[PDB]
Amino acid sequence: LFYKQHPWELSRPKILVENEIGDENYDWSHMLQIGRPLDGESVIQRTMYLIKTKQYGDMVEAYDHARYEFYALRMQEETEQQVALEEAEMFGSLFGVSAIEHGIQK
Amino acid sequence: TLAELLGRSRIAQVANNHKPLTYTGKKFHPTHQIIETKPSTLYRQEWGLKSAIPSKIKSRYLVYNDLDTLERITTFEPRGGTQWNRLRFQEMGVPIVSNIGRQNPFFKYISRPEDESHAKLSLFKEMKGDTDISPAAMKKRLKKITALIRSFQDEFKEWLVENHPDELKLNSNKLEDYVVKFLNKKLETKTNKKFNTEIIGTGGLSYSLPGKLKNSPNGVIQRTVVPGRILNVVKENNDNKWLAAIGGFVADVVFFQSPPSSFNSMGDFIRMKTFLFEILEASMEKNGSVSMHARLLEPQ
Amino acid sequence: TKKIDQSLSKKLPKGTIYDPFDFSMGRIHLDRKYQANKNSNRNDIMKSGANPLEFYARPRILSRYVTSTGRIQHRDITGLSAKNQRRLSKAIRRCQAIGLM
Amino acid sequence: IHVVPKLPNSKALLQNGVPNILSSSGFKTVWFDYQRYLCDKLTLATAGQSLESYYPFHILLKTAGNPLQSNIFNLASSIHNNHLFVENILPSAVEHGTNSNAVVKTEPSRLFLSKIKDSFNGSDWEVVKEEMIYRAENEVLGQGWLFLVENNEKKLFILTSNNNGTPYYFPRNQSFDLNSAISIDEFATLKQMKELIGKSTKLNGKVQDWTMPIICVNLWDHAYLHDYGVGNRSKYVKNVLDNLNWSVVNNRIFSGI
Amino acid sequence: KPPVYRLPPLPRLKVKKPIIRQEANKCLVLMSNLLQCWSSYGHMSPKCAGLVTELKSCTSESALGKRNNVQKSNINYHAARLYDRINGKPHD
Amino acid sequence: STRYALEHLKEGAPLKGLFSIEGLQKAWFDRVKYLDAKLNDCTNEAQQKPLETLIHENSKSASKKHIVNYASSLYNLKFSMSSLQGCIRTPPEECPRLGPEALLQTPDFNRTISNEPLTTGNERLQAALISSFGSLMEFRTLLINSNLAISGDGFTWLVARRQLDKRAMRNDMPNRDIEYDKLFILNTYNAGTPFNFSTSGVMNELNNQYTNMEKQRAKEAGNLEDSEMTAKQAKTKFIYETQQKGFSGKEVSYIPLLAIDASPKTWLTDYGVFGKREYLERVWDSIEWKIVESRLPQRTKIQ
């Protein structure tokens, strides 16, 4: 469902190579976790925690609640990257080729 | 247990996909999850899949359908190019806006029944939204529902004679209204398509909120200039706009007044040259496509 | 010459995403190879669930599954199920006997 | 996961701070808190990507040329720079926790004082320190970094960066503040840099820079405010340059043995 | 639904006469155009000057021009190499 | 310097809910004293002309930058503290200091809202914010996130584009010229100003000097121009210009309405290394929307 609703989340590369499954100490009371990316799986695990703690009864309601938490985190990252680029150019950072330029050359 | 671990494994995280890896139709959004391997693992053909990827593959990105097959191969294509389309859209810094002025899908808004006044439009959409349904499974929506709705006859044979008896003795124009509301009121509790698979907003292409200005050493940027390519040397047939290829997206380019003379000169090789464009707006259609409108900025 | 054959140039639709490979000849050849009449199902009455035998008095619909001379097309070409091919052929033969096809 | 490196004699650092520069509270802000803040943000930015397996110095070099990875570059640059600053101001790099050593008299080496004279037209180390303090006060309006760097020509020179500017890669030194006005000479430097970056044939548009830092001073508010206060950053830079650990700074100069 | 047809076990997987594409000689096409140019505008007409100049350069040293006049198909090498892996045969 | 004083900022008293007594000293009092001294040590007209005059008079000159850097740093800091009144939230000095765990908390800025302009009577400001940003949850998110992204010193501004890009008789009618087309959010870094009329084109102007100087040295050398230096400089100049033009003309100015400070000086003393977002949350709950509505120009109803 998540990737049907958000097709472009597929375009974010995923690494299937595991590090150590036994080291994962995650507290799914919050979506962000140290050691793993923010992605669709973050939403699914958050939804399961909500239904497991019985905060929400219907899976749809827990899923929607997790989705909004995911949108908030995605918006804060989209701004941190835009602003970081803008701030660097304002202090004299120079870049050889942009993504748009790379595509034109190819 | 092993079963619990497997469900949370990184391979389990990738949703099942059997969509053609070689698709020649119209592509509007990514269809396969891009898999990435680090340089160290690539040196050892390790991708976190079932089997080693052939050493011929030098890319670090692939898309796959099946971990293994009856042909003893992995079904994969060594490409990861939809990520560059998304990152190029981000570089153009054009927020996606609703051409219908709808609420932002990424915000938990307090909505009301303003659009719920079409209860008969969407309550019947469940049986009438069957454009591509089987000739008999869709017919199972007629007897299966009839019994479910027919089980509420006693409830509606009492509520209607206790809340609107006049209509039952005068006219059914209002009775039909009480019927549409009754089923919906008794269906909101039910779970018919409780999960909606429609694309939500941008679908993840952009999480940028409109309003922010782009500061630059040369002042605030008022117009976004992006290199592009004109595909056709003659406007889209039946349309007053040409087509351009900007940043992995096909846009509709509107010219100031006239078309530059390089068009006639170049002809069908017009795509061989790069022009500068201005991205006016970017919209999202229900099919999941992006409607990008541009303007052929010409040196003046 | 400022002209190219349509078979040597690909027209990228509007609203679609593209890769640099979409401007190559490989894309042209790849699109020819994988060019199948898959959109027929949505326009193919006989692949919708209707009984082809109900069209025995409608030669116009039946004439879509015969060659220019009236030869019924093999199932390999029509793409119908065994039952629909069997029913469609019966409809056409009945239509021929009635004097309509 | 990127974790905060353990520092030598950490119990002393958490009790008496860094003598003559920072107090215990001041050092907790600059290192134990800010370094934790940076590493956690770096882990969140890079976890699940190939960059997670690379040290911060390699991350900044890999991402230096990518405009939309500037956020990752900034975090990696700050993390590397902060441990370069905390390392040359540290009482002792060796762990005299069980040896209870209280005699660390480190002085500039002869190779350092020979390169100073060669590169600064005979100026003494004391005079160069005054130039460093002056450069920091007039070139870094807000946050930034002060570096003494060595280039491919064996010449020591002074580089200042705004916010998180790497000393290794000149396209990202961030030495010019374009928010304010720039002279024609500064615009010429920027224009010449842009031309050099355009001569590279690589598809990543990257150039070769062999500059290496020798001394690092953190000019961020996380390092001086609590102990010196707004406006007293020149008193902070003076103390840092006077109490440097020269066992570390001398080792950063290539000798060739 | 598209009917898959599975072969029985075979002693070999081979193409009897592999189809190899053979590109046309640039000198022969240059000659074919010049000959046509003379057919319309006339023999030695000033309109075919460029054609004559190009043909001479193409044929100056070799009448058919220097060309990669070799091409072989490898389908049978790969077909024989991969057949046992991909034929879907049941285990022994 | 009473010239840089606010009636809600009193030495020895804390701005309840945002700054403590030690935090308001360092943030404002101890900071204005330094900036004032530096401005009085660069220009002798500091105590003569208004700050905004110095900013728009000594601009675009590399020899007067220090006069404009300190002048615009004290202007931004005053404009930032002016719209702050306080909140009913627990005093910052009585709350526990946020630790590393704060970095893992999910922001709830897309589900809930608080201290909206309309709730206090500023109805014309709420309508403008909804029109330009779509909603007040979108505005709050785009405003708190833009400031949180700033790494070092800077300001997040709520600006209003001036619909007077004609340049004819400009700045002659305090109402006909004070008309706002649309509101926007803008980030400035270090001593950057939110106006954009006194600093735009700067790079284009310097770029044209560099090309002319290089072209004149080339003439001395005796060179036949170049194949693509006339086509590259032209493109660089054509883009520099097209990216600074306005809807009608090329006079795009902005009217400061609000400013949130991102400098660690403001929030490091009371909230700690991990408490910038807590600071920005209490800042939103401490904005007096009356002052902002006052600054708001009259809408340009050309429509």
H runs (alpha helix) in D200-224: 221-224
- D180 touches B: beta carbon within 8 Å: no
Asked if F143 and F185 count as a contact pair (C-beta separation under 8 A), the reply is: yes
Rounded-to-integer distance, Cα A98 and Cα A89, Å: 13
A80 vs chain D: nearest CA distance in angstroms?
7
Rounded-to-integer distance, Cα B229 and Cα F264, Å: 45
**Three-state SS for C99?**
coil
B72: chain E residues, CB-CB within 8 Å: 85-86
Contact check, Cβ <8 Å, F31/D74 = no
Interior CA angle at D116 toward D112 and D118, to 5°? 115
Q: Which of D37, D174, D178 to mutate to test the interface with A (most CBs of A within 10 A)?
A: D174
First-to-last alpha carbon distance for chain C, in angstroms, is: 50
Cβ neighbours of B242 (radius 10 Å): 22
Q: Tell me the pairing of strands B275-284 and B96-97.
A: parallel
Q: Do chains E and D touch (3 or more CB pairs under 8 A)?
A: no
**What is each CA distance from A75 to A81, B106, F142, F149, F183, in whole angstroms?**
10, 9, 9, 11, 20
Estimate to the nearest angstrom the gap between the alpha carbon of F3 and the chain centroid.
Answer: 20
D65: chain A residues, CB-CB within 8 Å: 95-97
Please give, one letter per residue, the 3-state secondary structure of B94-134: CCEECCCCCCCCCCCCCCCCCHHHHHHHHCCHHHHCCCCCC
DSSP state of A23: G
DSSP state of A30: S
**What is each CA distance from F214 to D188, D204, D221, in whole angstroms?**
10, 29, 42
Rounded-to-integer distance, Cα A9 and Cα B83, Å: 9
B264: chain C residues, CB-CB within 8 Å: 2
Burial class of residue F143 (count of CB atoms within 10 Å of its CB; 0-12, 13-18, 19+): buried
User: Which chains touch F (3+ CB pairs under 8 A)?
Assistant: A, B, D
- B275 touches C: beta carbon within 8 Å: no
Rounded-to-integer distance, Cα D178 and Cα A90, Å: 5
B225 vs chain C: nearest CA distance in angstroms?
20
**Three-state SS for F7?**
coil
Q: What is the dihedral of CA D29, D34, D36, D39, to 10 degrees?
A: -170
Asked if A10 and B42 count as a contact pair (C-beta separation under 8 A), the reply is: no
Identify the sign of the CA torsion B183, B186, B190, B195: positive
Q: What is the dihedral of CA B176, B177, B182, B185, to 10 degrees?
A: 150
Cβ neighbours of F168 (radius 10 Å): 8
Which of D67, D194, D197 has the CB atom closest to A98's CB atom?
Answer: D67
Domain boundaries, position C78: 44-100
Which of D50, D67, D68 has the CB atom closest to B38's CB atom?
Answer: D50
Residues 6+ apart with CB under 8 A from A60: B191, B194, B195
Rounded-to-integer distance, Cα B65 and Cα B45, Å: 18
Count interface pairs B-E at CB distance under 8 A.
8
- D2 touches F: beta carbon within 8 Å: no
Which of B109, B212, B218 has the CB atom closest to F200's CB atom?
Answer: B218
Rounded-to-integer distance, Cα B57 and Cα B37, Å: 12
Q: Tell me the pairing of strands F298-299 and F179-189.
A: parallel
Query: For D53, which residue in chain B has the nearest alpha carbon?
Result: B38
Looking at the DSSP assignment, which residues form a beta bridge with residue B230?
Answer: B244
Rounded-to-integer distance, Cα B172 and Cα B29, Å: 48
**Solved using:** cryo-EM
Rounded-to-integer distance, Cα F110 and Cα E54, Å: 70
F230 vs chain D: nearest CA distance in angstroms?
15
DSSP state of F287: B
Interior CA angle at D33 toward D29 and D38, to 5°? 120
- F106 touches A: beta carbon within 8 Å: yes
Contact check, Cβ <8 Å, D163/A91 = yes
Cβ neighbours of F21 (radius 10 Å): 13
Q: Which of B56, B69, B70 to mutate to test the interface with E (most CBs of E within 10 A)?
A: B70
Looking at the DSSP assignment, which residues form a beta bridge with residue B77?
Answer: B63
Rounded-to-integer distance, Cα C72 and Cα F191, Å: 83
Asked if F246 and F252 count as a contact pair (C-beta separation under 8 A), the reply is: yes
Give which of D44, D40, F129, A81 is closest to B207, Cα–Cα. A81
Asked if A14 and B63 count as a contact pair (C-beta separation under 8 A), the reply is: no
- A26 touches F: beta carbon within 8 Å: no
Find the radius of gyration of the CA atoms of chain E: 24
- A21 touches D: beta carbon within 8 Å: no
Element at E39 (helix H, strand E):
helix E26-41
B221 vs chain D: nearest CA distance in angstroms?
14
**Three-state SS for D121?**
coil
Cβ neighbours of B258 (radius 10 Å): 8
Estimate to the nearest angstrom the gap between the alpha carbon of D14 and the chain centroid.
Answer: 22
Residues 6+ apart with CB under 8 A from F78: F4, F6, F32, F51
Instruction: Cite the beta strand spans of F113-246 per DSSP E.
Output: 154-162, 179-189
**Quick one: tokens of D59?**
């991350």
Interior CA angle at B177 toward B173 and B178, to 5°? 115
Task: Describe the crossing of helices A59-90 and F136-149 by its angle, rounded to 10 degrees.
Answer: 50
First-to-last alpha carbon distance for chain E, in angstroms, is: 30
Interface of A with D in 33-52 (CB under 8 A): 34-39
Instruction: Cite the beta strand spans of F153-286 per DSSP E.
Output: 154-162, 179-189, 258-261
D177 vs chain B: nearest CA distance in angstroms?
9
Instruction: Cite the beta strand spans of F247-291 per DSSP E.
Output: 258-261
Cβ neighbours of D154 (radius 10 Å): 11
Contact check, Cβ <8 Å, D225/F26 = yes
DSSP state of D144: E
Furthest-apart CA atoms within chain C: distance in Å: 58
Which of A15, A32, A94 has the CB atom closest to D194's CB atom?
Answer: A94
Estimate to the nearest angstrom the gap between the alpha carbon of B269 and the chain centroid.
Answer: 32
Give which of D239, D17, D38, D83 is closest to D9, Cα–Cα. D17
Which residue type occupies E7? Answer: L
Q: Which of B56, B72, B75 to mutate to test the interface with E (most CBs of E within 10 A)?
A: B72
Which residue type occupies C19? Answer: D
Estimate to the nearest angstrom the gap between the alpha carbon of D62 and the chain centroid.
Answer: 18
Which of F34, F189, F264 has the CB atom closest to D179's CB atom?
Answer: F189
Contact check, Cβ <8 Å, A92/D175 = yes
Residues 6+ apart with CB under 8 A from B134: C49
- A77 touches B: beta carbon within 8 Å: yes
Backbone phi, then psi, for F154, in 5-degree steps?
Answer: 165, 180
Please give, one letter per residue, the 3-state secondary structure of A40-83: HHHHHHHHHHHHHHCCCCCHHHHHHHHHHHHHHHHHHHHHHHHH
Looking at the DSSP assignment, which residues form a beta bridge with residue B212?
Answer: F185
Residues 6+ apart with CB under 8 A from E11: none
**What is each CA distance from D124 to B82, D107, D113, D131, E85, in whole angstroms?**
58, 14, 8, 11, 76
**Three-state SS for E75?**
helix
Q: Do chains D and B touch (3 or more CB pairs under 8 A)?
A: yes
The sheet that has B61-66: what strands, in order across it? B35-36, B61-66, B75-77
Rounded-to-integer distance, Cα D72 and Cα D59, Å: 8
Identify the sign of the CA torsion D2, D8, D11, D12: negative
Asked if F111 and F119 count as a contact pair (C-beta separation under 8 A), the reply is: no
Interior CA angle at B137 toward B134 and B143, to 5°? 140
Which of F135, F183, F245 has the CB atom closest to B104's CB atom?
Answer: F135
Burial class of residue F198 (count of CB atoms within 10 Å of its CB; 0-12, 13-18, 19+): middle
Residues 6+ apart with CB under 8 A from A65: A47, A50, A56
Q: Tell me the pairing of strands B35-36 and B290-297.
A: unpaired
DSSP state of B221: B
Asked if C15 and B239 count as a contact pair (C-beta separation under 8 A), the reply is: no
Rounded-to-integer distance, Cα B222 and Cα D147, Å: 37
